[PDB]
Amino acid sequence: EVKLVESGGGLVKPGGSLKLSCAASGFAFSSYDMSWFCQTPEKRLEWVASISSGGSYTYYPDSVKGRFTISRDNARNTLYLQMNSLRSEDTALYYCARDYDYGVDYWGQGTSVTVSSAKTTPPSVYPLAPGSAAQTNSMVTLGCLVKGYFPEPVTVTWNSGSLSSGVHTFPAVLQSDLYTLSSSVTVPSSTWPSETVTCNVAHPASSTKVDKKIVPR
């Protein structure tokens, strides 16, 4: 039954504002104290804010006191986190959580927040085909390099999802204040290149979708 679904995360400029929401269902929302926590890019967990069942009592650590407000609408089974004066160190995955049983019992799915003055930039997508010299051949590995985009995330699939096994898509890295990621796929040397292999890349922030067919060198 207990379900917690955050929304409202996105890219925000340093000094800007964003309001997150958490829709609760499967339990009597108004009877429970609720909290926000976040997980940083380095995977540290931190407590962000807490609020009493009836909304009367609010608590904040010093890291956010004066900048963030937590509130709830018990008519709408919804918790909120108003975030002002945002800074780059606030970049994190924000989770709502239910306080119960002398701790926290359920966590939400999280909504991602990046605070940065860097602009939304669609990716360049480049094909990774083997060098003109080969060998090894039962299987051949191909890839896409998805370079110079921001903010996160991108999605990568191969032949529109038909393929799945043999694929590795690696976490993005920061390079010139933009993200770069790679994805490899491994197929039988028989099916490539006689059959086509295409990486499909989505970058929802720039409303962009790129197909790149891998062709021999």
């Binding site: 997980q39 995977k43 540290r44 967990l45 931190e46 407590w47 608590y59 650590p61 010093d62 989770y95 049983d101 002398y102 701790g103 926290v104 019992d105 359920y106 966590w107 939400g108 799915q109 999280g110 360049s124 480049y126 094909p127 990774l128 085909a129 083997p130 060098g131 010299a133 590995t141 890839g143 390099l145 370079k147 590795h168 690696f170 976490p171 993005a172 890295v173 390079q175 770069t180 990621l181 790679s182 490899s184 491994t186 060198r217």
Partner: protein
């Protein structure tokens, strides 16, 4: 804020074998009501945190009793009597006794499996990318175990660490291997001033380095 210290940072365990994790707090976690608000949670890769233990030794009902918690005062231990595949992920202790709530730094649990050699593939910069004036050489090293591996780039025989970025996947929940991409990034002009590019790896699975190389002509 109360400091929470976890030992070890890393565990590597074979299925069916026990493990334990230590949590030490900078101050006693006994609250004035006589209860000790010390908690453990698991975050599996790509999932939300899951409660394990609350009030030091109390077991979350979705968690099997092969997990137990103990301790008092400043010293606590999470024990797993026999590790199973799904135990893969980062374990955290956290305290609710003192304001602000604070978390341990996390202990990453890896599952041991049999040694597996990396599949290594090298890719010259695509034609496309050269037109942007940049050049990335990509090396994939896929499905290896253990995680210990040393990857070097050589240009015309000489080592280069400048412009290299590496990205690792999480341990696969299906085969318990790791994968990594290593990307060497030059300007087109720099790239074009050299002939030989090598991705060289050392791993316990082979008595000699794994070498993948191209010349570019």
């Amino acid at each position: 804020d109360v400091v929470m210290t976890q030992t070890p940072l890393t565990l590597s365990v074979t299925i069916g074998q026990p493990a334990s994790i230590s949590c030490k707090s900078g101050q006693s976690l006994l609250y004035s009501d006589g209860k000790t608000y010390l908690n453990w949670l698991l975050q599996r890769p790509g999932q939300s945190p899951k409660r394990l233990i609350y009030l030091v030794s109390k077991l979350d009902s979705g968690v099997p009793d092969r997990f137990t918690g103990s301790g008092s005062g400043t010293d606590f231990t999470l024990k797993i009597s026999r590790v199973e595949a799904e135990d893969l992920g980062i374990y955290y202790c956290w305290q609710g006794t003192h304001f602000p709530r604070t978390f341990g730094g996390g202990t990453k649990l890896e599952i041991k499996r049999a040694d597996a050699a990396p599949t290594v593939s090298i890719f010259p910069p695509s034609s496309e990318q050269l037109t942007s004036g940049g050049a990335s050489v990509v090396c994939f090293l896929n499905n290896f175990y253990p995680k210990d591996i040393n990857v070097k780039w050589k240009i015309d025989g000489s080592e280069r660490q400048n412009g290299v970025l590496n990205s690792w996947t999480d341990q696969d929940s299906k085969d318990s291997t790791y994968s990594m991409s290593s990307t060497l990034t030059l300007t087109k002009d720099e790239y074009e001033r050299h002939n030989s590019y090598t991705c060289e790896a050392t791993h316990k699975t082979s008595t000699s380095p794994i070498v993948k190389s191209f010349n570019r002509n």
